[PDB]
Amino acid sequence: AEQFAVGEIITDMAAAAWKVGLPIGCIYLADMNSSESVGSDAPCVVKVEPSDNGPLFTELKFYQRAAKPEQIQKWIRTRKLKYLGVPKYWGSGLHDKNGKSYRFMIMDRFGSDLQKIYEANAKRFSRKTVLQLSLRILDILEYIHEHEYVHGDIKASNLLLNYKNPDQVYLVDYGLAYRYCPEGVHKAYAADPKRCHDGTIEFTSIDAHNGVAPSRRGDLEILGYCMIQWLTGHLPWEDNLKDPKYVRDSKIRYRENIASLMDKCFPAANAPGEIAKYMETVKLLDYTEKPLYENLRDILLQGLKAIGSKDDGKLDL
Ligand SMILES: [Cl-]
């Protein structure tokens, strides 16, 4: 069912006016209201779903709580970042059509996802690329964690490049994001009956596989599996993804013996040292424990030193 009449003007709850464009979930190009049509280079998108859609409500709440343009900018200034890969929230509202109620949200428009680019590079990213991606993902994770949320589903298809700057990567898709710490009260080590989702099976955390709610260590664990996938094209459990108990068993055993994971994934060869160190540091975290993000970033910075490079913000894609 069509949710918009192309080129109509929609007004958000803050009375800001936007125009709807072509598709690019149900996502359309959007821009500020003007005499012009919305073009292919539009700086925004409008996400629209029925008002009873759970994920868009969850996502909207995340964006309203943590992604206000001046909230992000303040954090950038105070932590001295070049940028922060949390997309900006521009507004939202309610839209009725054909007697059905819809929710809509306006957010930044992006370029390509990383999964497309990974597959065009024969399912490899270079070590330089992986370290630079991971540093920026750590900035993002620290931010969202400090604002009471975990993502639980970090992967290359949820990483998008700035439309005007291909060295800036953004983490998208908060429809299934979890408020692990509402009002500073950490959730208990247990399943949340309100949350069904377990992340993406090849990348998800051991906590998720055990059926408990995702926490901060889980996000960092997910990023660890992504790094291996990106560097090598593979994960050990990739042929058993229809069998969750196998995937969990494998992740548990490999966490208990990280050297065996390194031998498995970097076979007959030295493993890049930063990856084992990253994983050893994450392994030390308890469920409720606050990560030492700077130490994790130091581990990756040492990997850049090791290859004759530095954090110059260049993703080399
Ligand atoms: Cl804040």
Ligand SMILES: [Cl-]
């Ligand atoms: Cl291959």
